[PDB]
Write a protein that binds this ligand. Structure first.
Ligand SMILES: *[C@@H]1O[C@H](CO)[C@@H](O[C@@H]2O[C@H](CO)[C@@H](O[C@@H]3O[C@H](CO)[C@@H](O)[C@H](O)[C@H]3NC(C)=O)[C@H](O)[C@H]2NC(C)=O)[C@H](O)[C@H]1NC(C)=O
Ligand SMILES: *[C@@H]1O[C@H](CO)[C@@H](O[C@@H]2O[C@H](CO)[C@@H](O)[C@H](O)[C@H]2NC(C)=O)[C@H](O)[C@H]1NC(C)=O
Ligand SMILES: CCc1nc(CC(C)(C)C)c(CN)c(-c2ccc(C)cc2)c1CC(=O)O
Ligand SMILES: CCc1nc(CC(C)(C)C)c(CN)c(-c2ccc(C)cc2)c1CC(=O)O
Ligand SMILES: *[C@@H]1O[C@H](CO)[C@@H](O)[C@H](O)[C@H]1NC(C)=O
Ligand SMILES: *[C@@H]1O[C@H](CO)[C@@H](O)[C@H](O)[C@H]1NC(C)=O
Ligand SMILES: *[C@@H]1O[C@H](CO)[C@@H](O)[C@H](O)[C@H]1NC(C)=O
Ligand SMILES: *[C@@H]1O[C@H](CO)[C@@H](O)[C@H](O)[C@H]1NC(C)=O
Ligand SMILES: *[C@@H]1O[C@H](CO)[C@@H](O)[C@H](O)[C@H]1NC(C)=O
Ligand SMILES: *[C@@H]1O[C@H](CO)[C@@H](O)[C@H](O)[C@H]1NC(C)=O
Ligand SMILES: *[C@@H]1O[C@H](CO)[C@@H](O)[C@H](O)[C@H]1NC(C)=O
Ligand SMILES: *[C@@H]1O[C@H](CO)[C@@H](O)[C@H](O)[C@H]1NC(C)=O
Lengths: 726, 727, 74
């Protein structure tokens, strides 16, 4: 038997996880059953901590919970209503975590946007109607920090649509000081930001469709503006409104449109801020000390470090974050070296030049932990594979003596790692993501030895024994003296003397990686296991984790090299002799939707057919922060010419050679239906037949249980027919 | 050799020729030739060139349409045509003088003018601009502002709001001149509490943010626009003072709740008839209103009121029918359902309560086309007992039993569908013939009744078409409970009853619909029948029109029931007929038809393999109030909510697992909103049924754009071909 | 009246006057200046300037301004 569509859609063969949240440097929590238990590692044992049926009589079903770092209060989250990718709305209730009695008075209000404990003690910070509130005790009246909060126009301590999606990847824009004395926050001003407007059809009982109006800056439009503040949570009278000390952006930033792109505390009294110019090739970091006598914040002009880029933009998606030594007089941050590669720099607060603590033809992925002895980080060095993740440990006292940690713990099963550290890194967890079944293991960083297996996924392993699973290749091809990596999802009982159809699974967007060592049970698994379709993905120009030379390649030049490199990919695959040339398809979601569209638009005649889900159609339609990073401004004096040369509409005439499926959710707040509306219109006008599917009230995820089920069924029907599959 | 292909249909290969004339006097009409516009003498035809097409080019715009003043002195010129809804649009206007030689330059008609009309004699103008009414006594003089209240999307003076345009007046105009252009009567519509349908218009790829279009549109049960009525006196317009308009208020029984103004007809120089309709559309009232000098006001005497009601259904076919006053205005004729339920001509006296019927029978009068003093002229489907035929009749007024069929016999093989254009006092008439053969336009005298000349016999079209293998049309009936129900079939050429043909059921099936008729058409079906060998059939079952009230009011308060079942029963009778492949029977429709199709596909009947729904209604709460409520009453617990509730297509989603479905809809459909199809797709996704969708960006209800018209038919053609396993 | 202080940004090529370097001069008893606001005399480094302004007794005296501080000293 094979891994069917219903198997993927009903999640029969489930990957097991080990999610743990460290309350301390010793103990973590795990939902094992329905209820929460406290685990250790010092003698190794564990005990039952609390039940989801200690709050059975609560009345509601809790969406999430939160522990107050001191361990005295639990914060229960229910009435969850989703907004965008991260933003949402909930009701919150607090318990005296000891007595497990509900805190009855001064309750946190319904319709709260964000809530967060101080890193120590049990202070609260919440956002409600775009305003910031603070609760020193979970049973005392809140202290109202901001008063400017206005729906859709002024966000205090939460992000607007674009800062949520592209800049912070979070709703909240609040940052407590290490020891909970100071609360920093951003305030976003959407006043002149244009609204995207779209209909929401709602339940069928809704007679007249609603119009949703999100302030959303499309490429070139009036962006939001941002101010930054710090407030002292201790000294906080009720007799007088709380005064909030502003920190303005540096001069070189105030001179034109800009973004606040990083917030990192250093000590109780030191905060660091990274600002980005709207043209995202220049970025500045301010370090700001508190003044005990002023009550104010001073960022020294000489202390300003600058992150520049003349080959492309800055960062991978945003400038990298700093990690501060305990004294706060020094920090490490991942940056690009003189020849492309992204490595860790040791900055001395009181000067300009870092020195690189790493070098070579491989990028560092992220800094995971810092002690005053070593520095822990993830990279793709092992076996010079960019699609692999391994955990490394570098000695601060000697930068040349770098010991690996994960790489060889299990080489065959495990080439892709992530790590969750304890509260001071006395222990750490390893998520192995593949290419074998995910493996979760608890280690001690004391003597770097392994403690125990947390999840070896043998349960899933056992019921995958009588399934004919797809296999997976992961290898490079050389193009113009460059290693370009691809992956293949090969059908079981693969026979390279046979000719298999192929689906090119494309994302291809800036700094992407579709060819990795990650193990996945997805739609491609069904396609190979059942339909005997090879599913392949190729990391061409503009993909990530290979240096600035490959990644910046598409700078100001989207819809070119990454599009062209996807076609060349197929040519290479087919010319490996196991591919039916006559049956090659292409598909992608979001950016990949755009690339698929572009390829089917290119007229190369490699591709028989293709699917594009929520594609971009022309870059002016997508949002400023993302689009402008790689494209610039759509003005005649910048890149308006190329914005025009990259629209899918302009290639409508070419879709006559291909069978095409275009799918889009009508309530897609991210990639707007508009984009697909313009593709279809463009196609109609040249007289090309294609398939279409809108999804009423689905967003960019098309993630409703029933919609998800439907879109994959539909696409399966499409691909099979295109492929003459019975 | 060859057949009627898709490109044929789509590229308009075999054109159909019309003869679009405009009467101007009693003996003369206008036609266009080399683009040159000529006047013809009906008696002789010694036709001279009226206005050669070289006069308007250096003038430098696009002459979309034109209009002569009735006295013949001035030509109105329409340009910058920008469409609103079905009828409503906006344009710039220049006036051209024949006598003074050149065009007018001073006090010019505004850009963005909503509507323009001449007085019925002379050369007065009345126009609406920015929802307000203006009058030009002389094309060159300043205009007198009649109304100061008009506010965009809210107060509509002399033009209709969305619903009144589509549903009541089938016009953008709410202006009616008195016969000799002395009085200007108008309606004012208020949409203050009318909710707005809102939808994205996407425009050119150059528009960065989609525009939200917003339109006052009462859905079933929603707050309706209100209506007031006025008459102004144009001869007594003062420059020094604001012109006063006299309000005629609706009768007591109408103000007692929501209502509509449905009809406006001037009777005489100083007499107007107004028909009002209750919101529950089974009770309507006609007011005859006379001017009174010594008061200045208008009086509609209670004793001259005329109630027109229905207990089986609604009043009228779609609206109460219009009066036809005798020259002296003391009497009128109108089509009303009789005691048998058949629509016939009733003769009414202003100063009396009962009418007397002057036609009767098991058939219906379609329209009163002319009324002289010797003859009533009317179109009916009496001939041969074919409800799908239309012929011309004259009633000898002096003895209404003496009736003559003017068109029946002229050419009974070629011609059984007719319409008529009468000259101003009916001295002459154009007869248009629309089927079953090729269209035929003929010009006639009323005195002798002799045919004068063939204006257009489509021989040009006949020439090419005898090389093409064309489908026949069979028009017949089947008997269901000793009731005849008619169908038509577009039969592939060389049709063989030994063979089993795939069948496509072409469905409208709205109230008072008629899909089975004698009209000749060149459509998508002509292609399916000729090229693909699909039998396409249509069937007029219960709810359908021109066959009496018993059949038409059968769906009263019960939409999405009998008209749906009768479509299913049709196909059954069509299989049972012996020349139909059971395994290949599809169904498709547009508007109401799209609703029926969807309702049939979800039926569980299992008769139908696959179906196509274009811009369907999904549930009746989504459609406009005056159409829907005519048939459904209000969606309330007190009226007809349960049935609104049972008659949605969404509640049948589960059953779509049984058919192959294609659901198509334009996004800028202001009529049946894209909403309706959004809710269908969503209901289908929710029960895990696979269907096919196609949205059309910025298209409206007609999906009428050149390229979008071609696209949708090509798309449908592929769906049908696959469903029927055609290569 | 408002004194803007504008710097040439090298990478830009453009000129920029930061709002925090804006200096306001106004009068409640009449017009600002003798016939126009007074001209600034900058110290060599550009960071400071002297200016004749009316003092709180309506007497025109030399005030010492810092580019960043709103308030001067006479
Ligand atoms: C978010 O940004 C908005 C600008 O996009 C800010 O709104 C501006 O603030 C000004 C002061 O409140 C407005 O009015 C000015 O008021 C002064 C008072 O003395 C008058 O002299 C000015 O003539 C007057 N300006 C005008 C043109 O009326 C601005 O008009 C106003 N701009 C807007 C709303 O578009 C918001 O205050 C800001 N919010 C926060 C808290 O940062
Ligand atoms: C259009 O209709 C509205 C009612 O929907 C009328 O507005 C009312 O005006 C009267 C004044 O006599 C007020 O008492 C009401 O409060 C108003 N209603 C609302 C909610 O606006 C208005 O009179 C109508 N306009 C015209 C031209 O007749
Ligand atoms: C991890 C998924 C993701 N995350 C992000 C946000 C970060 C880049 C910060 C991570 C973005 C940027 N909006 C996208 C994205 C969306 C649309 C397009 C045209 C391009 C990129 C995606 C892809 C997706 O939503 O499917
Ligand atoms: C002849 C065209 C037409 N004219 C009219 C207007 C009158 C009935 C007054 C004549 C209407 C009524 N809105 C419709 C119609 C539209 C939608 C629906 C659900 C039902 C009926 C159509 C059908 C169409 O638009 O194709
Ligand atoms: C929130 O929900 C409802 C208000 O409709 C009410 O029963 C309850 O008191 C509210 N609770 C809080 C925490 O304010
Ligand atoms: C705080 O500020 C707001 C408006 O700025 C004001 O209305 C309110 O009274 C103030 N509250 C206190 C306690 O001063
Ligand atoms: C209408 O439009 C044209 C072109 O903009 C212009 O010549 C004319 O003066 C405008 N207005 C009037 C009053 O017709
Ligand atoms: C007529 O009425 C309008 C609006 O009521 C008023 O403003 C105006 O004074 C009058 N028009 C003239 C010019 O007499
Ligand atoms: C038009 O009709 C009105 C009202 O009957 C009357 O005053 C006038 O005589 C008529 N004018 C002409 C020219 O017929
Ligand atoms: C008989 O009456 C009608 C005739 O119009 C027919 O369509 C229907 O099937 C029958 N009715 C019932 C309920 O038997
Ligand atoms: C960033 O990009 C621009 C546009 O290509 C380029 O001219 C320059 O290198 C950078 N601009 C600035 C102001 O730093
Ligand atoms: C400037 O003058 C105006 C008008 O005389 C007056 O309202 C105001 O007092 C003055 N403003 C200032 C800033 O003194």
């Amino acid at each position: 038997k094979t891994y069917t569509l219903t198997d993927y859609l009903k999640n029969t063969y489930r990957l097991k996880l080990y999610s743990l949240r460290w309350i301390s440097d010793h103990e973590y929590l795990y939902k094992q059953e329905n209820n929460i238990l406290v685990f250790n590692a010092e003698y190794g044992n564990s005990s039952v901590f609390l039940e989801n049926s200690t709050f059975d009589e609560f009345g509601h079903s809790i969406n999430d919970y939160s522990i107050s770092p001191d361990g005295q209060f639990i914060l229960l989250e229910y009435n969850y209503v989703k907004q965008w990718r991260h933003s949402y709305t909930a009701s919150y209730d607090i318990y005296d975590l000891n007595k497990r009695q509900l805190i009855t008075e001064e309750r946190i209000p319904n319709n709260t946007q964000w809530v967060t404990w101080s890193p120590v003690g049990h202070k609260l910070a919440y956002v409600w109607n775009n305003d910031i509130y603070v609760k020193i005790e979970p049973n005392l009246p809140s202290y109202r920090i901001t008063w400017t909060g206005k729906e859709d126009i002024i966000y205090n301590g939460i992000t607007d649509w674009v800062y949520e999606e592209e800049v912070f990847s979070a709703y909240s824009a609040l940052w407590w000081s290490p020891n909970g004395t100071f609360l920093a926050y951003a305030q976003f001003n959407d006043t002149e930001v244009p609204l995207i407007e779209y209909s929401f059809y709602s339940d069928e009982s809704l007679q007249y469709p609603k119009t949703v109006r999100v302030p959303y800056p499309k490429a070139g439009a009036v962006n939001p503006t941002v101010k930054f503040f710090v407030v002292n949570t201790d000294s906080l009278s009720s007799v007088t409104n709380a005064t909030s000390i502003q920190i303005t952006a540096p001069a070189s930033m105030l001179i034109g449109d800009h973004y606040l792109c990083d917030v990192t505390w250093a000590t109780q009294e030191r905060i660091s801020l990274q600002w980005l110019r709207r043209i995202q090739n220049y970025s500045v970091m301010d370090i700001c000390d508190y003044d005990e006598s002023s009550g104010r914040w001073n960022c020294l002009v000489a202390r300003q470090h600058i992150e520049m880029s003349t080959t492309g933009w800055v960062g991978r998606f945003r400038p990298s974050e700093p990690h501060f030594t305990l004294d706060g007089n020094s920090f490490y941050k991942i940056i690009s070296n003189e020849e492309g590669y992204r490595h860790i720099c040791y900055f001395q607060i009181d000067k300009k030049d870092c020195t690189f603590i790493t070098k070579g033809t491989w990028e560092v992925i992220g800094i995971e932990a810092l002690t005053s002895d070593y520095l822990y980080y993830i990279s793709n060095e092992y076996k010079g594979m960019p699609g692999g993740r391994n955990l490394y440990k570098i000695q601060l006292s000697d930068y040349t003596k770098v010991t690996c940690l994960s790489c060889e713990l299990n080489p065959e099963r495990c080439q892709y790692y992530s790590v969750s550290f304890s509260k001071e890194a006395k222990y750490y967890q390893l998520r192995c993501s593949g290419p074998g079944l995910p493996l979760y293991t608890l280690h001690s960083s004391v003597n770097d030895k392994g403690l125990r297996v947390l999840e070896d996924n043998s349960a899933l392993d056992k019921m995958l024994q009588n399934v004919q699973m797809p296999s997976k290749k992961l290898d490079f091809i050389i193009l113009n003296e460059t290693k370009f990596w691809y992956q293949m999802i090969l059908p079981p009982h693969f026979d390279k003397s046979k000719k298999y159809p192929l689906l090119l699974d494309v994302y291809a967007g800036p700094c992407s990686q579709k060819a990795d060592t990650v193990f996945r049970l997805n739609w491609a698994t069904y396609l190979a296991s059942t339909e005997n379709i090879i599913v392949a993905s190729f990391d061409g120009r503009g993909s990530g984790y290979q240096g600035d030379k490959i990644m910046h390649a598409i700078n100001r030049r989207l819809g070119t090299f990454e599009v062209e490199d996807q076609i060349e990919a197929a040519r290479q695959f087919s010319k490996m002799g196991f591919v039916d040339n006559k049956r090659i398809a292409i598909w992608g979601w979001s950016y990949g939707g755009y690339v698929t569209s572009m390829v089917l638009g290119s007229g190369s005649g490699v591709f028989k057919c293709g699917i594009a889900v929520a594609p971009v159609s022309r870059w002016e339609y997508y949002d400023s922060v993302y689009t402008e990073r790689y494209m610039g401004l759509p003005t005649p004096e910048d890149n308006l010419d190329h914005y025009r040369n990259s629209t899918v509409m302009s290639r409508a005439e070419n879709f006559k050679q291909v069978e095409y499926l275009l799918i889009h959710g009508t309530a897609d707040d991210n990639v707007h239906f508009q984009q697909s509306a313009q593709i279809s219109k463009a196609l109609v006008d040249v007289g090309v037949d294609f398939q279409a599917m809108w999804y009423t009230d689905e967003d960019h995820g098309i993630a409703s249980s029933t919609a998800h089920q439907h879109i994959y069924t539909h696409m399966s029907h499409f691909i099979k027919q295109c492929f003459s599959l019975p």
